[PDB]
């Protein structure tokens, strides 16, 4: 009967239903040998003494993926380097093709694999400068914004993606200048702009050391990262 030989064509076809592409996710900077695909689920036997198929990798850009044809497993090859999702490497995904050749009939089927690289909160906020400064006139009204130096990446930045890379600024109490966190405020944590909260008096105090901490916005509070800078505020008379 016609199609009685169709069994010969089964090797290299997927041994699973669902869509043709195989898509997985792994964390950036996973260690060498991390399993990417535990089992490609391709019909047939590769390797061994009587294989029915030949499996290999195509379009393996920079050789990030290693294939064990016997187990049909794909692993990360990252010895001597790191799979970095953040700049400057910017690896958000890896796409490779698992080429399958059917030995009996010579047909070739390509099984696309997409590895989605997840961002980790592996970077802390970093300030562009080692310290910040503002000069404020003694007559400045309370409520006036007196420092905007964190505007347009001059403050803290964080190279992670999403909330992991978004910054919040808060003023901390300074034991060596106790009144500084009472005299100045950051009412809007996203900008880090500093506002005068109390009337100044040049005859009493001429310099304030304001401790400002930047944190990122990682979902898990215990995975958040923080960095601190000092804003020195000097009063002017004239």
């Amino acid at each position: 009967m016609q199609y009685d030989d169709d069994w010969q064509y089964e090797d290299c076809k997927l041994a699973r239903g669902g869509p043709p592409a195989t898509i997985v996710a792994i964390d950036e900077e996973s260690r060498n040998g991390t399993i990417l695909v535990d089992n490609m689920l391709i019909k047939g036997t590769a390797g061994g003494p009587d294989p029915t198929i030949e499996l290999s990798l195509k379009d393996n850009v920079d050789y990030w993926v290693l294939l064990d044809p016997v187990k049909q497993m794909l692993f990360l090859n990252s010895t001597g380097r790191v799979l970095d999702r953040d700049p400057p490497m910017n690896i958000h995904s890896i796409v490779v093709q698992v080429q399958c050749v059917n030995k009996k009939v010579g047909t070739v089927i390509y099984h696309e694999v997409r590895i989605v690289v997840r961002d980790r909160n592996d970077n802390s906020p970093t300030f562009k400068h080692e310290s910040y400064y503002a000069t404020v006139n003694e007559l400045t009204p309370v409520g006036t914004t007196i420092f905007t130096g964190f505007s347009g990446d001059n403050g803290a930045t964080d190279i992670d993606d999403g909330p992991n890379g978004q910054i919040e600024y808060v003023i901390q109490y300074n034991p060596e200048d106790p009144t500084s966190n009472d005299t100045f405020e950051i009412p809007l944590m996203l900008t880090g702009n500093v506002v005068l909260r109390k009337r100044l008096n040049y005859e009493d105090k001429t310099r304030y050391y304001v401790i400002i901490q930047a944190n990122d916005r990682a979902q898990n509070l215990n995975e958040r990262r923080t960095t601190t800078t000092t804003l020195t505020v000097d009063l002017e008379h004239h």
Partner: protein
Amino acid sequence: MQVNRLPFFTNHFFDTYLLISEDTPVGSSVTQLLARDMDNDPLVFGVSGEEASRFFAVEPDTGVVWLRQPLDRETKSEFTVEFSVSDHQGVITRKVNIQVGDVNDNAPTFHNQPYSVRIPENTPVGTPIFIVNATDPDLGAGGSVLYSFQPPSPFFAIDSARGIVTVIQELDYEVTQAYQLTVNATDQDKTRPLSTLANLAIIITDLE
């Protein structure tokens, strides 16, 4: 006085990707945006960007995302889309990678047509005389082509994987001067295989 707290998305898909099959019907919901606001503010959802906005729509009050026009993995296999959520005082955005899932929706296309070849009547059995080729852009089995004659010819065979045509029986010009064979190129999709026909003319040249 409490300053406004801006809303934030909670979907876990923002940390990975969103997969939408290319056969998703227009008008169909593909996901629902979720967000929270520390002020308990009612939130309005949207989509930003020229090209994204042409493919996706968003119900403003629910965050339900739906398909505004058909997807086509063979025309565009992924989008980066920026979604928005607003509490009426500010708007925040966040991007997601959308991967377009494949379905078998193309038939093979033949290369180098038209197909015609002249061969002498004394061409030996086993001689390769012609090579057909077709390609197919779908993924996996849906893109792997098999060749056949429809119906099989007792004088010519075609390699199902390679498209090589061979003479399989001694020819006789006075019996048949020309053959018009139909070549079928099919993909190997399990549920919805697609195929295409091409003519192959084989002209037999006389010896006497």
